[PDB]
Each structure stands twice: as C-alpha cells, then as structure tokens.
Amino acid sequence: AFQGRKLTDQERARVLEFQDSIHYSPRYSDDNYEYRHVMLPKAMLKVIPSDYFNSEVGTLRILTEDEWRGLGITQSLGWEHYECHAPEPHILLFKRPLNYEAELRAAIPITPT
C-alpha cells in the first residue's frame, strides 16, 4: 500500500542508476532530534520526476518515507524528511526523535472461529 506517488518502472530505473553515488552525512543531535542530511549527485536531480519538486522554489517537496526510499535513498528506520531553509536542492534534510525504539511490527493472520 504505497504512500505517495510511486515511481513507474521506467522512472525508477532512471533514478536507481545514481544510487551508489548518494552521500550520507554523519548524524548530529539536539535535545529532541537526531539529524543528518543526504546529498544527491546533481545529475540525479535531472531524472527525478517533475512532480517531486514544488514549482515555487526549485527544491524537492516533502517526501513520504515510501517516496524517498523509492528514490534509492537508503538509511535506517525512523528518519523523517523535513523542509529546510533554501539550500542547494540536492541536499535533503532528515530527522528522527532521540527517543526512537525502531521496532518491526507485522500483523499476522489466523483463521476465524
């Protein structure tokens, strides 16, 4: 049940070619959040589909977790994409709470009575 605008098999192939060139900053923290930023190759920006930018700035819009994992951006559980200042568009900011427990929860089905 994809949240957000899933890429097509065609978009996805085009974006996933840049996956090995994405850079991930060290994490830093304040009183409530850990932060990190992800830096995309400028060339990847060219094949990121048009609806993923917001026409106003030139920056990426807020991405859902499914959306940005969709782009090849690979990091651990808990990270939220948030809107920054107006940096270069190829820098994406992420945060997650310090009080993060990172579980894996799956409902499992039984036969009804």
UniProtKB/Swiss-Prot annotation:
Protein name: Cyclin-dependent kinases regulatory subunit
Assembly behavior: Forms a stable but non-covalent complex with the CDC28 protein and with a cyclin.
Source organism of this protein record: Saccharomyces cerevisiae (strain ATCC 204508 / S288c) (Baker's yeast)
Sorted UniProt keywords: Cell cycle, Cell division
An individual GO BP term: regulation of mitotic cell cycle
UniProt miscellaneous comment: Present with 8780 molecules/cell in log phase SD medium.
Keyword Cell division: yes
GO MF, one example: histone binding
The family this protein is said to belong to: Belongs to the CKS family.
Cell cycle in keyword set: yes
Function, in words: Binds to the catalytic subunit of the cyclin dependent kinase (CDC28) and is essential for its biological function.
GO CC terms in record: cyclin-dependent protein kinase holoenzyme complex; cytoplasm; nucleus; SCF ubiquitin ligase complex
Superkingdom classification of source: Eukaryota
